[PDB]
Amino acid sequence: LKCKKLVPLFSKTCPAGKNLCYKMFMVAAPHVPVKRGCIDVCPKSSLLVKYVCCNTDKCN
Known part of the structure; x- marks a missing residue:
């Protein structure tokens, strides 16, 4: 469950x-x-708006 954020926020679990x-x-x-x-x-x-979710790493 590794989701990435928007800078300057990097990647985080x-x-x-x-x-x-x-x-x-x-x-x-x-x-x-x-x-x-x-x-x-x-x-x-x-x-x-459209809120697409995913259960994969670096998906969002």
Whole structure:
């Protein structure tokens, strides 16, 4: 469960509480993310924002 963050924050292993990686972006530019961190439960996506989760290293 190795999730990366946004600079200057480097890579870090999701600490107790989070075991998944979350990546929120705008449903328009499916290339450049907005925010990336750790999460416990994967929320639902919307028609505006999209929160894609993954259970892999350097996924988010």
